[PDB]
Amino acid sequence: MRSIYLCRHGESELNLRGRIGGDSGLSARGKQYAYALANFIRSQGISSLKVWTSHMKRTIQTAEALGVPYEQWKALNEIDAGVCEEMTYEEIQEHYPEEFALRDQDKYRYRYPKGESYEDLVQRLEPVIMELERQENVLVICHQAVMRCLLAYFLDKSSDELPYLKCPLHTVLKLTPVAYGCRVESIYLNV
Amino acid sequence: MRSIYLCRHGESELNLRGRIGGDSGLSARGKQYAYALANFIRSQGISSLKVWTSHMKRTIQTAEALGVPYEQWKALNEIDAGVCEEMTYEEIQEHYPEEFALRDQDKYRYRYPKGESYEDLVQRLEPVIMELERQENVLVICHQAVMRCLLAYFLDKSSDELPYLKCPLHTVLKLTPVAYGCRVESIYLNV
Ligand SMILES: O=C[C@@H](O)COP(=O)(O)O
Ligand SMILES: O=C[C@@H](O)COP(=O)(O)O
């Protein structure tokens, strides 16, 4: 059957600097992953694959290694942390202790000033999920928050579980949707 | 009336890099806080203030700027992240994915591989709290997880609330234990 492969962009510069969001490029080992992903996809022996990315440099650069064309979806853009974009957690805690604490009580519906919530991201992904449900083999090179929302849908996860879903870097999740439910397979690309 | 001044060390190098634990020294503006603290303390005109720090460079260095003598307590050292020491949250999610997920399940009792938990921390702080109770004016320059436990005791917090207490950097928490409970005053030192 067809499979949807979800994975985050290769490790970014900001990832490396403990900062969130932004629009940075891939780190040295971040590019190593892109290539390792290319080989993984190759080893799968797929005849036709649709590769989707976001408008972020980090997803695009990852796709560049695949050597194949890819489509850029804005809805696959990472969650907007608002004023807290490009900050570390400590930096957020110090200058926005009120907001940070408010997020922990309802991480699904909380929005940082000028930012999106997890709930917002979900609604924004509806068209992507819809298209995904009517396609064959698709690879979605996205982001942690985005990946969590898609992953929550295919695995019937509650909004409460969603924001805490396991979504590490350099790890490909092979989803195989069936009659009901979806098979999952985690493949870590050590680089 | 006696007051307990709880605060963290000045921003450390690892704090600046978003990595946990370790034993790094204060950053540039970390020192500015130490100085800003020295000013705030003098301005408080405290009578025979006792100063406690941990055995970590970051707490000691902050106390140095005070001029007045301080006392080091091993029992005030930050929570041991175990094998996850000095890693960033991403590194933790990628290399110890299951462990990271198991954390949020029960953050009070969860320990990283070969690491401490909030409960272990509470335990080694018992003596610290006893001494803190049989004193008058004390200034404790410690760490985040440590500060949460002391703060948890004085504000009569539950073990579930504890791990999520607001303990930002560069912020003095003046606790004035009274009859009805404990009065709180937060003084952020912007540097
Ligand atoms: O950019 C980080 C987003 O994934 C928000 O989720 P988080 O709780 O892991 O920080
Ligand atoms: O070193 C960080 C400790 O405070 C652990 O608690 P945390 O959930 O705020 O990271």
Short mmCIF file of C-alpha atoms and ligand atoms in Angstrom, two decimals:
data_model
loop_
_atom_site.label_atom_id
_atom_site.label_comp_id
_atom_site.label_asym_id
_atom_site.label_seq_id
_atom_site.Cartn_x
_atom_site.Cartn_y
_atom_site.Cartn_z
CA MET A 1 0.00 0.00 0.00
CA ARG A 2 1.04 3.65 -0.19
CA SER A 3 2.88 5.29 2.69
CA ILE A 4 3.26 8.84 3.90
CA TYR A 5 6.72 9.55 5.31
CA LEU A 6 6.80 12.35 7.89
CA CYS A 7 10.10 13.84 9.00
CA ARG A 8 11.48 17.20 10.09
CA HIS A 9 14.05 19.19 8.17
CA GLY A 10 17.66 18.30 8.89
CA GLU A 11 19.07 19.85 12.10
CA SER A 12 19.12 23.65 11.77
CA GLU A 13 21.50 26.33 13.03
CA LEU A 14 18.92 27.61 15.49
CA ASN A 15 18.23 24.06 16.64
CA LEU A 16 21.90 23.80 17.43
CA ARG A 17 21.70 27.07 19.38
CA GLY A 18 18.77 25.92 21.52
CA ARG A 19 16.54 28.54 19.93
CA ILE A 20 13.02 28.08 18.56
CA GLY A 21 11.38 28.97 15.27
CA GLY A 22 13.09 31.32 12.88
CA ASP A 23 14.19 30.58 9.35
CA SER A 24 17.78 29.35 9.60
CA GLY A 25 19.68 26.92 7.38
CA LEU A 26 20.86 23.37 7.98
CA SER A 27 23.82 22.68 10.26
CA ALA A 28 26.79 20.64 9.02
CA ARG A 29 25.23 17.40 10.26
CA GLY A 30 21.86 18.79 9.19
CA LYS A 31 22.92 18.41 5.56
CA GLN A 32 24.38 14.96 6.29
CA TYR A 33 20.83 14.00 7.23
CA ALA A 34 19.33 15.33 4.02
CA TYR A 35 21.62 12.95 2.11
CA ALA A 36 20.88 10.05 4.46
CA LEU A 37 17.18 10.72 3.89
CA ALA A 38 17.75 10.61 0.12
CA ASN A 39 19.30 7.16 0.48
CA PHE A 40 16.50 5.99 2.77
CA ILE A 41 13.81 7.07 0.30
CA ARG A 42 15.85 5.37 -2.44
CA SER A 43 16.07 2.12 -0.44
CA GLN A 44 12.28 2.11 -0.20
CA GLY A 45 12.04 1.37 -3.93
CA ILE A 46 9.22 3.78 -4.71
CA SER A 47 8.22 4.49 -8.32
CA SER A 48 6.29 7.73 -7.77
CA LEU A 49 6.61 9.96 -4.73
CA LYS A 50 5.26 13.41 -3.95
CA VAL A 51 7.63 15.46 -1.80
CA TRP A 52 6.17 18.35 0.20
CA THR A 53 8.06 20.97 2.15
CA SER A 54 7.25 24.33 3.75
CA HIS A 55 8.48 27.79 2.81
CA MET A 56 11.29 27.50 5.39
CA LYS A 57 14.89 27.24 4.15
CA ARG A 58 15.49 24.26 6.41
CA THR A 59 12.84 22.02 4.81
CA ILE A 60 13.72 23.14 1.29
CA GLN A 61 17.45 22.53 1.80
CA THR A 62 16.60 19.05 3.06
CA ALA A 63 14.58 18.40 -0.09
CA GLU A 64 17.42 19.65 -2.29
CA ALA A 65 19.37 16.51 -1.40
CA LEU A 66 16.65 14.25 -2.80
CA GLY A 67 17.46 15.44 -6.31
CA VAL A 68 13.75 15.30 -7.18
CA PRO A 69 11.13 18.06 -7.54
CA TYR A 70 9.16 19.05 -4.43
CA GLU A 71 6.13 21.28 -3.73
CA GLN A 72 6.26 24.17 -1.24
CA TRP A 73 3.21 24.47 1.01
CA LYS A 74 2.81 27.50 3.28
CA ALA A 75 0.52 25.48 5.54
CA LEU A 76 3.52 23.29 6.34
CA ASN A 77 5.29 26.29 7.90
CA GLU A 78 6.20 25.88 11.57
CA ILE A 79 4.06 27.19 14.39
CA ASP A 80 4.58 30.91 14.92
CA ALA A 81 5.92 31.56 18.43
CA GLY A 82 5.15 35.26 18.00
CA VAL A 83 7.29 37.58 20.12
CA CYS A 84 9.09 34.46 21.42
CA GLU A 85 10.43 33.53 17.97
CA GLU A 86 14.18 32.74 17.90
CA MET A 87 14.47 32.68 21.71
CA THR A 88 15.71 29.99 24.11
CA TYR A 89 13.42 28.62 26.82
CA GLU A 90 15.30 30.47 29.56
CA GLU A 91 15.07 33.66 27.52
CA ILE A 92 11.31 33.11 27.29
CA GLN A 93 10.99 32.31 31.01
CA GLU A 94 12.85 35.47 32.06
CA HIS A 95 11.20 38.03 29.79
CA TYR A 96 7.80 36.34 29.43
CA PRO A 97 7.26 34.38 32.66
CA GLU A 98 3.52 35.05 32.56
CA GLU A 99 3.00 33.79 29.02
CA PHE A 100 5.29 30.76 29.47
CA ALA A 101 3.35 29.64 32.54
CA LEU A 102 0.02 30.22 30.76
CA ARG A 103 1.16 27.98 27.92
CA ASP A 104 1.80 25.11 30.32
CA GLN A 105 -1.80 25.09 31.53
CA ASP A 106 -3.29 24.75 28.03
CA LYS A 107 -0.50 24.11 25.54
CA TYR A 108 -3.07 23.28 22.85
CA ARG A 109 -4.99 26.58 22.88
CA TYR A 110 -2.34 29.03 24.12
CA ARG A 111 -0.90 31.65 21.77
CA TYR A 112 2.25 33.62 22.60
CA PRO A 113 1.75 37.33 21.90
CA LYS A 114 1.39 37.64 18.10
CA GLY A 115 1.57 33.86 17.71
CA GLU A 116 -0.37 30.72 16.77
CA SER A 117 -1.54 27.98 19.10
CA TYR A 118 -1.41 24.25 18.36
CA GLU A 119 -5.14 24.40 17.67
CA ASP A 120 -4.50 27.14 15.08
CA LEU A 121 -1.87 24.97 13.35
CA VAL A 122 -4.32 22.05 13.15
CA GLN A 123 -7.03 24.05 11.34
CA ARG A 124 -4.33 25.43 9.04
CA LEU A 125 -3.30 21.86 8.16
CA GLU A 126 -6.79 20.66 7.16
CA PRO A 127 -6.17 21.21 3.42
CA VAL A 128 -2.84 19.35 3.69
CA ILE A 129 -4.44 16.39 5.46
CA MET A 130 -7.25 16.37 2.89
CA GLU A 131 -4.85 16.25 -0.03
CA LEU A 132 -2.72 13.70 1.80
CA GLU A 133 -5.75 11.41 2.26
CA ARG A 134 -6.38 11.42 -1.52
CA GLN A 135 -2.78 10.82 -2.65
CA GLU A 136 -0.39 7.88 -2.87
CA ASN A 137 3.22 7.86 -1.63
CA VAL A 138 4.02 11.26 -0.12
CA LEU A 139 7.01 12.55 1.88
CA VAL A 140 6.32 15.53 4.16
CA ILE A 141 9.54 17.31 5.20
CA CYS A 142 8.17 19.68 7.82
CA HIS A 143 8.60 20.83 11.45
CA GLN A 144 8.06 19.52 14.96
CA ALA A 145 4.75 21.23 15.71
CA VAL A 146 3.37 20.60 12.18
CA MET A 147 4.58 16.99 12.23
CA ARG A 148 2.90 16.52 15.63
CA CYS A 149 -0.45 17.70 14.28
CA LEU A 150 -0.33 15.43 11.22
CA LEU A 151 0.94 12.57 13.38
CA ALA A 152 -1.88 13.12 15.86
CA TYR A 153 -4.49 12.90 13.10
CA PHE A 154 -3.23 9.64 11.58
CA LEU A 155 -2.86 8.00 14.99
CA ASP A 156 -6.10 9.22 16.60
CA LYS A 157 -4.47 11.30 19.32
CA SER A 158 -6.42 13.76 21.47
CA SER A 159 -5.58 17.47 21.42
CA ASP A 160 -4.24 16.92 24.94
CA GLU A 161 -1.74 14.27 23.77
CA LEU A 162 -0.81 16.10 20.55
CA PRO A 163 1.59 18.83 21.83
CA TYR A 164 3.63 16.19 23.66
CA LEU A 165 3.90 13.70 20.80
CA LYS A 166 7.39 12.33 20.26
CA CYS A 167 8.93 14.06 17.19
CA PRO A 168 12.77 14.03 17.34
CA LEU A 169 15.02 15.28 14.54
CA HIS A 170 16.56 12.90 12.00
CA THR A 171 13.77 10.36 12.51
CA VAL A 172 11.45 9.29 9.71
CA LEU A 173 7.94 8.09 10.48
CA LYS A 174 6.56 5.76 7.83
CA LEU A 175 2.76 5.94 8.06
CA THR A 176 0.66 3.42 6.15
CA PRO A 177 -3.01 4.40 6.30
CA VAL A 178 -5.49 1.55 6.01
CA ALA A 179 -9.24 0.88 6.40
CA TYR A 180 -9.17 2.32 9.89
CA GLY A 181 -6.13 3.55 11.75
CA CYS A 182 -2.64 3.77 10.31
CA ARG A 183 0.48 1.64 10.68
CA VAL A 184 3.54 3.45 12.01
CA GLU A 185 7.25 2.77 11.74
CA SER A 186 10.00 4.98 13.19
CA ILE A 187 13.35 5.03 11.38
CA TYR A 188 16.20 6.98 12.95
CA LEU A 189 18.86 8.21 10.53
CA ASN A 190 22.00 8.38 12.66
CA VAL A 191 24.32 11.14 11.42
CA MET B 1 9.90 40.63 60.03
CA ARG B 2 12.32 38.09 58.55
CA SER B 3 12.56 37.55 54.78
CA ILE B 4 13.99 34.82 52.55
CA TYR B 5 15.43 36.05 49.27
CA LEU B 6 15.38 33.28 46.67
CA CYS B 7 17.09 33.81 43.36
CA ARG B 8 19.08 31.96 40.75
CA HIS B 9 22.69 32.51 39.79
CA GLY B 10 23.43 34.96 36.98
CA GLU B 11 22.88 33.76 33.40
CA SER B 12 25.52 31.09 32.74
CA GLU B 13 27.32 30.14 29.53
CA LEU B 14 25.23 26.96 29.13
CA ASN B 15 22.10 29.01 29.93
CA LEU B 16 23.12 31.19 27.01
CA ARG B 17 23.46 28.03 24.87
CA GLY B 18 20.20 26.45 26.04
CA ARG B 19 21.96 23.42 27.49
CA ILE B 20 21.03 22.00 30.91
CA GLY B 21 23.07 21.21 34.01
CA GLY B 22 26.84 21.26 33.91
CA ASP B 23 29.04 23.71 35.79
CA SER B 24 29.68 26.71 33.56
CA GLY B 25 30.48 30.22 34.70
CA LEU B 26 28.43 33.38 34.36
CA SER B 27 28.15 35.06 30.96
CA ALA B 28 28.84 38.75 30.37
CA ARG B 29 25.41 40.00 31.44
CA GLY B 30 25.39 37.21 34.00
CA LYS B 31 27.92 39.29 35.91
CA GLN B 32 25.85 42.42 35.37
CA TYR B 33 23.11 40.68 37.33
CA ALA B 34 25.54 39.79 40.12
CA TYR B 35 26.34 43.50 40.34
CA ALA B 36 22.68 44.49 40.06
CA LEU B 37 21.98 42.02 42.87
CA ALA B 38 24.72 43.56 45.00
CA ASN B 39 22.99 46.94 44.55
CA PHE B 40 19.49 45.62 45.30
CA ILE B 41 20.75 43.85 48.43
CA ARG B 42 22.49 46.96 49.78
CA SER B 43 19.41 49.07 49.09
CA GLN B 44 17.28 46.63 51.10
CA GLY B 45 19.20 47.57 54.25
CA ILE B 46 18.91 44.02 55.54
CA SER B 47 20.04 43.26 59.11
CA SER B 48 22.69 40.52 59.30
CA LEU B 49 21.78 38.90 55.97
CA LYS B 50 23.16 35.35 55.62
CA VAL B 51 24.14 34.33 52.09
CA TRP B 52 23.96 30.75 50.80
CA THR B 53 25.22 29.41 47.48
CA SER B 54 25.79 25.93 46.03
CA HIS B 55 29.10 24.25 45.18
CA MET B 56 28.65 25.35 41.55
CA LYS B 57 30.74 28.11 39.96
CA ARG B 58 27.66 29.94 38.71
CA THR B 59 26.22 30.48 42.21
CA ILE B 60 29.59 31.27 43.83
CA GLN B 61 30.54 33.84 41.19
CA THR B 62 27.21 35.62 41.66
CA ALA B 63 27.82 35.87 45.42
CA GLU B 64 31.34 37.21 44.83
CA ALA B 65 29.90 40.46 43.53
CA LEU B 66 28.09 40.91 46.84
CA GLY B 67 31.31 41.71 48.68
CA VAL B 68 29.87 40.28 51.91
CA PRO B 69 30.78 36.67 52.93
CA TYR B 70 28.73 33.70 51.71
CA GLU B 71 28.39 30.01 52.62
CA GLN B 72 28.37 27.09 50.14
CA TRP B 73 25.93 24.16 50.45
CA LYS B 74 26.37 21.00 48.37
CA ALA B 75 22.69 20.32 49.07
CA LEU B 76 21.78 23.37 46.99
CA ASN B 77 23.39 22.07 43.77
CA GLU B 78 21.07 21.91 40.71
CA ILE B 79 19.20 18.73 39.82
CA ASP B 80 21.40 16.08 38.19
CA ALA B 81 20.29 15.51 34.60
CA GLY B 82 22.29 12.30 34.67
CA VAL B 83 23.40 11.14 31.25
CA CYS B 84 21.45 14.06 29.75
CA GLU B 85 23.79 16.57 31.40
CA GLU B 86 24.78 19.52 29.17
CA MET B 87 22.53 18.47 26.30
CA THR B 88 19.97 20.74 24.63
CA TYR B 89 16.31 19.74 24.69
CA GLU B 90 16.50 18.72 21.04
CA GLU B 91 19.51 16.47 21.70
CA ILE B 92 17.47 14.88 24.50
CA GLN B 93 14.45 14.34 22.25
CA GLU B 94 16.62 12.78 19.52
CA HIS B 95 18.96 10.60 21.55
CA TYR B 96 16.64 9.70 24.45
CA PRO B 97 13.17 9.98 22.83
CA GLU B 98 11.34 7.48 25.05
CA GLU B 99 12.89 8.95 28.21
CA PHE B 100 11.86 12.47 27.25
CA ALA B 101 8.26 11.31 26.76
CA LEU B 102 8.27 9.40 30.07
CA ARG B 103 9.17 12.66 31.81
CA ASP B 104 5.99 14.68 31.35
CA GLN B 105 4.07 11.61 32.50
CA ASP B 106 5.16 12.25 36.09
CA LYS B 107 7.64 15.12 36.16
CA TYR B 108 7.88 15.04 39.96
CA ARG B 109 9.19 11.47 40.21
CA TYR B 110 10.80 11.00 36.76
CA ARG B 111 14.58 10.57 36.57
CA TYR B 112 16.75 10.69 33.43
CA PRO B 113 19.14 7.74 33.00
CA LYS B 114 21.50 7.94 36.01
CA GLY B 115 19.92 11.27 36.98
CA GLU B 116 17.88 12.85 39.78
CA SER B 117 14.17 13.60 40.07
CA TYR B 118 12.27 16.41 41.78
CA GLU B 119 11.60 14.04 44.68
CA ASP B 120 15.31 13.28 45.19
CA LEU B 121 15.89 17.02 45.12
CA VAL B 122 13.22 17.66 47.78
CA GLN B 123 14.93 15.04 49.94
CA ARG B 124 18.42 16.58 49.92
CA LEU B 125 16.90 20.00 50.59
CA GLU B 126 15.15 18.98 53.82
CA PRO B 127 18.14 20.00 55.96
CA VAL B 128 18.48 23.23 53.95
CA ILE B 129 14.86 24.10 54.74
CA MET B 130 15.26 23.27 58.45
CA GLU B 131 18.21 25.65 58.71
CA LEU B 132 16.39 28.20 56.54
CA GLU B 133 13.47 27.98 58.99
CA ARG B 134 15.61 28.53 62.11
CA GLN B 135 17.12 31.72 60.64
CA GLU B 136 16.15 35.36 60.12
CA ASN B 137 17.24 37.08 56.90
CA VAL B 138 18.72 34.78 54.30
CA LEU B 139 19.56 35.17 50.61
CA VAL B 140 19.73 31.89 48.68
CA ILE B 141 21.43 32.21 45.27
CA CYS B 142 20.75 28.79 43.75
CA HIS B 143 19.31 27.04 40.71
CA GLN B 144 15.99 26.57 38.90
CA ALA B 145 14.90 23.11 40.05
CA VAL B 146 16.29 23.80 43.52
CA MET B 147 14.55 27.17 43.73
CA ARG B 148 11.27 25.52 42.73
CA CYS B 149 11.42 23.11 45.66
CA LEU B 150 12.20 25.81 48.25
CA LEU B 151 9.56 28.03 46.69
CA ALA B 152 7.19 25.04 46.71
CA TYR B 153 7.61 24.63 50.45
CA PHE B 154 7.01 28.26 51.44
CA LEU B 155 4.05 28.77 49.11
CA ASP B 156 2.48 25.46 50.21
CA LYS B 157 2.56 23.88 46.73
CA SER B 158 1.66 20.32 45.77
CA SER B 159 4.15 17.89 44.27
CA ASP B 160 2.22 18.20 40.99
CA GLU B 161 2.51 22.01 40.93
CA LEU B 162 6.17 22.06 42.03
CA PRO B 163 8.03 21.14 38.80
CA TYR B 164 6.13 23.89 36.95
CA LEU B 165 6.79 26.82 39.28
CA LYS B 166 7.84 30.13 37.78
CA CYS B 167 11.59 30.45 38.51
CA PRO B 168 13.06 32.79 35.84
CA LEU B 169 16.61 34.10 35.73
CA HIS B 170 17.58 37.52 37.04
CA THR B 171 14.60 37.68 39.39
CA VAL B 172 14.66 37.96 43.18
CA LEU B 173 11.79 36.32 45.05
CA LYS B 174 11.39 37.86 48.48
CA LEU B 175 9.41 35.46 50.64
CA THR B 176 8.03 36.86 53.87
CA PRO B 177 6.65 33.96 55.96
CA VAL B 178 3.64 35.24 57.89
CA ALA B 179 0.65 33.83 59.79
CA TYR B 180 -1.78 33.19 56.92
CA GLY B 181 1.00 31.65 54.84
CA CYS B 182 3.70 33.56 52.99
CA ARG B 183 3.80 36.93 51.23
CA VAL B 184 5.70 37.10 47.92
CA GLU B 185 7.49 39.93 46.15
CA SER B 186 9.13 39.50 42.75
CA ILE B 187 11.91 41.92 41.84
CA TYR B 188 13.21 41.53 38.29
CA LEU B 189 16.68 42.97 37.77
CA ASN B 190 16.88 44.02 34.10
CA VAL B 191 20.45 43.79 32.77
O1 LIG C 1 9.23 24.90 17.83
C1 LIG C 1 8.90 24.11 18.95
C2 LIG C 1 7.50 23.61 18.80
O2 LIG C 1 7.59 22.24 18.50
C3 LIG C 1 6.69 23.73 20.14
O3 LIG C 1 6.62 22.47 20.88
P1 LIG C 1 7.62 22.14 22.18
O4 LIG C 1 6.81 21.92 23.45
O5 LIG C 1 8.45 20.89 21.94
O6 LIG C 1 8.56 23.32 22.42
O1 LIG C 2 17.88 22.41 34.75
C1 LIG C 2 16.51 22.54 34.49
C2 LIG C 2 15.73 22.03 35.67
O2 LIG C 2 15.04 23.14 36.20
C3 LIG C 2 14.65 20.98 35.25
O3 LIG C 2 13.29 21.54 35.18
P1 LIG C 2 12.69 22.16 33.75
O4 LIG C 2 11.44 21.40 33.31
O5 LIG C 2 12.32 23.63 33.92
O6 LIG C 2 13.74 22.03 32.66
#
